[PDB]
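Lecture 7, part B: from sequences to assemblies.

Below are the input chains for today's worked example.
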Amino acid sequence: CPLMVKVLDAVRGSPAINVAVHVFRKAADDTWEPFASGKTSESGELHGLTTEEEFVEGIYKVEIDTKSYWKALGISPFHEHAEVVFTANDSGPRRYTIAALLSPYSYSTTAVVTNP
Amino acid sequence: CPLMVKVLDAVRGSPAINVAVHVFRKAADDTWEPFASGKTSESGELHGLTTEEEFVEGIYKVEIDTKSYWKALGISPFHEHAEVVFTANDSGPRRYTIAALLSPYSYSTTAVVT
Amino acid sequence: CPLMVKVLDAVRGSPAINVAVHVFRKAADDTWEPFASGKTSESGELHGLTTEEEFVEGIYKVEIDTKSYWKALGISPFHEHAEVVFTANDSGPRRYTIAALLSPYSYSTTAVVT
Amino acid sequence: CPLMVKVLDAVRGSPAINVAVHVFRKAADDTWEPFASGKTSESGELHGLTTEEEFVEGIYKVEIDTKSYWKALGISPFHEHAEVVFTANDSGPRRYTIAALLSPYSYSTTAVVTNP
Ligand SMILES: O=C(Nc1ccc(Oc2ccc(Cl)cc2)c(Cl)c1)c1cc(I)cc(I)c1O
Ligand SMILES: O=C(Nc1ccc(Oc2ccc(Cl)cc2)c(Cl)c1)c1cc(I)cc(I)c1O
Ligand code: NA
Ligand code: NA
Ligand code: NA
Ligand code: NA
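Predicted structure of the full complex, as structure tokens:
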């Protein structure tokens, strides 16, 4: 599991459950190729997106569908989504955890990068 | 204006208006003594807390009454308040902006020292 | 000034100066077309991006070149940039401030809509 | 484990390891009574602070010694510490996770509250 995503809800003080997450990788022609997708669990975590073999060097985009999350709670939020774009594995394989903290008009994102 | 406080509301996407803010300075007996007070304006800002002459080296605490702010909006908050504790003017006067971004179960605070 | 961007540096406690910012608007073919551009001032602010007449309903992307900012300081960053994507003026003109707080491995963004 | 603390470093993209954390509970005379303390592990997590029996209703303060953390890294930070003050267990026992994200001139804190 070299790529994990965790999402928290700053309004309710809870994991953000059932949030859709789409991962893309920049292709040779500069377009965003679909790479993996999933949804956060009851713990707010999304595991199993990829493998060490599949998760090669590249520029990756993680798009978290925060708009659908807020709308289901009856809230009209500001952002269309929360996105994280980063170069991965440039100095060799690493494990990446992307965390996002969500409010209707704000989000914060952080990465922890570890060397296995 | 060597010390300014700005408060924003991450739920409504607005300045946080009428938020009570108390500033304390640590005294020799390690007690917090009142130093300045006010409430945020319609822009979420609190100016005129102190003067350069009064704002000397020390440890300061800025206490933002976030609980009363959320209660006024009918929202149950987690924190009793948001406190920001820092050393100021330990190398002579400086200008300090303390910004706070509020959510019911989270807050962020940053300092801009110019 | 219906759209303003402010960028702060959480490592140095300062405005983030000379940060390149590009604004795009989503077109009918779902491509991002250039809409406005600039760089933050010495106060970390970018004003004068658009006018009320030009800033119509649409989906907008504000792309902040955070990587170049950290590289200029000799600091290795995580993100390629910070993007903020939002729908604006879908109920008529509004005023929008997008603030971003930057750290090498983290950023926060908030909108104040007045 | 009804009270857990997690601390992350936003400059390095890592857990904040060996960070001292002091917990206090407001006493009947309005003073802060020492309640528990510990330090974050190699994962940035501090477990085992208290028990269900010990962690009664009250107003609690969690003080995270961010100044010593930054100074050990050669950085002179802004804050003396990061503190979180909250009423706990008012509607019955809950589990609290307090997370803090640290930068030299900024910190963010969030709570997740769950009902066991
Ligand atoms: O933020 C993080 N971790 C976390 C985990 C659990 C937390 O609290 C609960 C409690 C119960 C439930 Cl069900 C869900 C969440 C909280 Cl507040 C925070 C986190 C962020 C990054 I970048 C990297 C790693 I590696 C992390 O671990
Ligand atoms: O965060 C800051 N500044 C800011 C200013 C304006 C903003 O947007 C509006 C728009 C209309 C209104 Cl009425 C209120 C707020 C937002 Cl969001 C943020 C800020 C934080 C620090 I540390 C230091 C300085 I120096 C700052 O400026
Ligand atoms: Na390489
Ligand atoms: Na000194
Ligand atoms: Na409309
Ligand atoms: Na009760």
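Note for the exam: The pocket of sodium ion (ligand 4) is lined by residues B 90-91 (CB under 6 Å). Keep this in mind when comparing with the next example.
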